C-alpha cells in the first residue's frame, strides 16, 4: 500500500484502537451494572443458602 495511504489509515486505525478502549470502558460500566444486578441477586442468594 502507498505510505501516504498507510499513514492515513494509521490515523484512522489509531482512532479505531481508541474506540476499542472506549468500548472496553463501556464493558466495564456494563460489568458494574451487572454487579448492581448481582447485589439484588444477593438477597436471592441468601434465600438459596
Amino acid at each position: 500500500k502507498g505510505p501516504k495511504e498507510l499513514e492515513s489509515i494509521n490515523a484512522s486505525m489509531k482512532s479505531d484502537i481508541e474506540n476499542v478502549r472506549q468500548e472496553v470502558s463501556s464493558y466495564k460500566e456494563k460489568w458494574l451494572r451487572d454487579a448492581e444486578i448481582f447485589g439484588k441477586i444477593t438477597s436471592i442468594f441468601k434465600e438459596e443458602l
Binding site: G2, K4, E5, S8
Partner: protein, 52 residues
Amino acid sequence: TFEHLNRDTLRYINLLKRLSVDLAKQVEVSDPSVTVYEMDKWVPSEKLQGIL
C-alpha cells in the same frame, strides 16, 4: 560533421516525446471530496521531482 550533427539531432528529438519512458502512476488522494480522479493530472511527489 554536418551530416553527423543532423542525424544526432533527429535521434534526440525522436527520443523526447516519441520514445520517452515514464513513471508507474500509482495514485492515492488525501481529500475525501475528490470522488473522481482525472488520472492524467497525477504527478510525482515534490521530493522525488527534485532528484529527477
